[PDB]
């Protein structure tokens, strides 16, 4: 009967907690207590991109690290050349309320979706020269919150329907549905190997999914509110998570638990987006407060702040070359930052 | 700049021209969020105004003012994340099935949830107490009564400034304005005056509802600018 299963659930949760406490021999704060402080990272807005018309909800970098997709409530995707600030493409969306976009590792495609509960795959490199919808992925039964390409033909796609799905773009069908979540899946990050991904949800949990085996490899539950944001550490064996509670937390896959919690009492508002730098040494977190703070990911102290935005910083991204962090906000502007010594 | 850079900046300028045209479209368009449970008949309101997909954009126009009304639907039963998008709509329209008393309580709690939400602290709600004909019929049949569900309807008696329709019975007036007052108590409770609730009684036979929403948005924007000007 049900009571036996609910009890064995409690027992197995206790077993998991005991194994984690057994592994918790030392904190990251202790092991990194003697590593050098990174010091103040006075990043500067090298470019402001001014073309969007409403609240920007998402951006994603190309692997080329200069092209930059950006989605806004206006129902546009703009492809930006970050270097020149040029608008490479402006894509009229079939729905205004886009909430995620992705740029394919090839840059042949950009994905976006939102309250349409549909991801439109847009072919950037048509012979007809206009950008057009390559596929219109449907099967999600709720809003579409994040998507990331694995390949020109595969996209992983989280939804408020509490599921993530892997899609075969050439056939428009879900090749795997990930269904252990119990709340709106808000955030999604592919491992650099693309064989694993983490997805964070409003059940305050992050889950690690095997893309091809199809099952929850393990589950992370340290947060107190909705995990708005998630990002793998570039080693691919830890990931950061940003919540409605003002903390972000770094979970190690192999230690199966929080290494570190990034929080400061001056910060009382939700984290909106999270990205690591190429070394993983910086964790960059966007906030409801219009700042995005830079954290020492090892020591957990506020190495800096990017303060130029006039509204909620909705999305962060570091280039794959690491040369810059882009930052979109609800003020419709998209700022690219680096220091220059 | 290279010739190709010159042409790419030309392209960026041309896209900026198109984005400026869409800025004209987008600021002339007023966005509305059409909330309400499945009983509310909000789909009938959509149909009568127009004459697995997660959102339906009902475009309509009154006196050359364009309105886009987003009937959000086929979403899951937690709204608390996607309502963050509709910050900076001109209004939320919240259709209530006035007839469905047992679901009227969850409609009230859902109104409280919208009104109190940190992202909606400034977004006015146009209540459409729909199915007012079915409500009239139910009360004139008398088989089940508000008193079975809200005992304060003994203490409550019609406002001194209620204005019944000529064929409207005073008990229908009592039910109407009690439901209204129930919502208004929440609104006048939590509202700092950043945002106000504009109840209208309506039925499926209303052609006027586009005019209603036009007038309500006009009042919302006037009150908003006057608050900004410290005149209200």
């Amino acid at each position, epitope marked *: 009967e049900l009571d036996q299963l609910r009890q064995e659930a409690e027992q197995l949760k206790n077993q998991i907690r005991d194994a984690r406490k057994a592994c918790a021999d030392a904190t990251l704060s202790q092991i990194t207590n003697n590593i050098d402080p990174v010091g103040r990272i006075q990043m500067r807005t090298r470019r402001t991109l001014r073309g969007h018309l409403a609240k920007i909800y998402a951006m994603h970098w190309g692997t080329d690290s200069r092209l930059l997709v950006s989605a806004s409530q206006d129902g546009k995707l703009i492809i930006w050349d970050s270097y020149t600030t040029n608008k490479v493409h402006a894509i009229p969306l079939r729905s205004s309320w886009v909430m995620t976009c992705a740029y394919a590792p090839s840059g042949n495609y950009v994905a976006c979706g939102g309250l349409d509960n549909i991801c439109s795959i847009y072919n950037l490199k048509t012979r007809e020269g206009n950008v057009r919808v390559s596929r219109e992925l449907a099967g999600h039964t709720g809003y579409l919150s994040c998507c990331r390409f694995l390949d020109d033909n595969q996209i992983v796609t989280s939804s408020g329907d509490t599921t993530c799905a892997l899609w075969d773009i050439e056939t428009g069908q879900q090749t795997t549905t990930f269904t252990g979540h119990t709340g709106d899946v808000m955030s999604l990050s592919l491992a650099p190997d693309t064989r694993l991904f983490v997805s964070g949800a409003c059940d305050a949990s992050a889950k690690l999914w095997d893309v091809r085996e199809g099952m929850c490899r393990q589950t992370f539950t340290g947060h107190e509110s909705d995990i708005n944001a998630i990002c793998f550490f570039p080693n691919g064996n830890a990931f950061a998570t940003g919540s409605d509670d003002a903390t972000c937390r770094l979970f190690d896959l192999r230690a199966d638990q929080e290494l570190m919690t990034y929080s400061h009492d001056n910060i009382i508002c939700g984290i909106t987006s999270v990205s690591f730098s190429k070394s993983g040494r910086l964790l960059l977190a966007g906030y409801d407060d219009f700042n995005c703070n830079v954290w020492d990911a090892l020591k957990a102290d506020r190495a800096g702040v990017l303060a130029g935005h006039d509204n909620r910083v909705s999305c962060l991204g570091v280039t794959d070359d690491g040369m810059a962090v882009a930052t979109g906000s609800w003020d419709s502007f998209l700022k690219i930052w680096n220091g220059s010594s | 700049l290279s010739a190709e850079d010159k*042409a*790419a900046v030309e392209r960026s300028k041309m896209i900026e021209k198109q984005l400026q045209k869409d800025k004209q479209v987008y600021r002339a368009t007023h966005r509305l969020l059409l909330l309400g449970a499945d009983n509310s008949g909000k789909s009938t309101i959509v149909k009568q105004m127009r004459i697995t997909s997660g959102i339906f954009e009902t475009k309509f126009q009154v006196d050359k003012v364009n309105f886009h009304m987003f009937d959000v639907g086929a979403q899951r039963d937690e709204r608390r994340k996607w309502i963050q998008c509709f910050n900076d709509v001109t209004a939320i329209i919240f259709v209530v099935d006035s007839s469905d008393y047992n679901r009227l309580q969850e409609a009230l709690n859902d109104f409280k949830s919208i009104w109190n939400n940190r992202w909606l602290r400034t977004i006015s709600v146009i209540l459409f107490l729909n199915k007012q004909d079915l409500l009239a019929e139910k009360v004139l049949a008398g088989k089940s009564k508000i008193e079975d569900y809200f005992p304060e309807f003994a203490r409550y008696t019609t406002p001194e400034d209620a204005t019944p329709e000529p064929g409207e019975d005073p008990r229908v007036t009592r039910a109407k304005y009690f439901i209204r007052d129930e919502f208004l108590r929440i609104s006048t409770a939590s509202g700092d005056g950043r945002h106000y609730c504009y109840p209208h009684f309506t039925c499926s036979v209303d052609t006027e509802n586009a005019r209603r929403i036009f007038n309500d948005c006009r009042d919302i924007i006037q009150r908003m600018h006057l608050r900004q000007y410290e005149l209200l």
Partner: single-chain antibody
Amino acid sequence: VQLVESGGGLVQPGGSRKLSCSASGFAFSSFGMHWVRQAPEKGLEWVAYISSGSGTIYYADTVKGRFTISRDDPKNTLFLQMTSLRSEDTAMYYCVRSIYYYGSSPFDFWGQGTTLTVSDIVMTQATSSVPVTPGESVSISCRSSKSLLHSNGNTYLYWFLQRPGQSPQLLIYRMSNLASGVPDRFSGSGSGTAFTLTISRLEAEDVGVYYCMQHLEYPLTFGAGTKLEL
């Protein structure tokens, strides 16, 4: 995609003729358009350019006072109104689309051409012809009087192949970058001042005249072309 040029035939000297080109199946308004002409026995020569939205218009000095290029985007039709035509304007005139954004391949599609009979950086291709065999790993040299490496890092040498009965076709846009449709049997390399196309295994579809072209600055000159003879 089907650029089809119309007009042409004979004219008397001093005459006037309006060439046109219907764009057919592509987003013509978003492309810049070029006219390029080929004299009966000679290499390609750029004639005129009109941007998307007609903002930029550029001409070669051989036509600058004489030809006017215009476009009707609602019709998806390009025009070249020629005036004061002269014997040196006798050519096949190719309409050539171009699109300019990071990573774009301009000059990627060429129309069938219309023949008209009237009754700068220098690109040097010192090989007027090379005799070649199937499977041979042939290379085509090109040289420039100005370094085509711009400070933005691009090296604006394009390579075109004109097969004996066809229009030119883009092979390489920047000196490294192969076009989206072309065999990786082709490759390009260069120093900004000197350049090679390479064809690691020839086949009969590679027979033709190979033109290098600079897009560093207008007037956008082509080379004399290297013929490959099988």
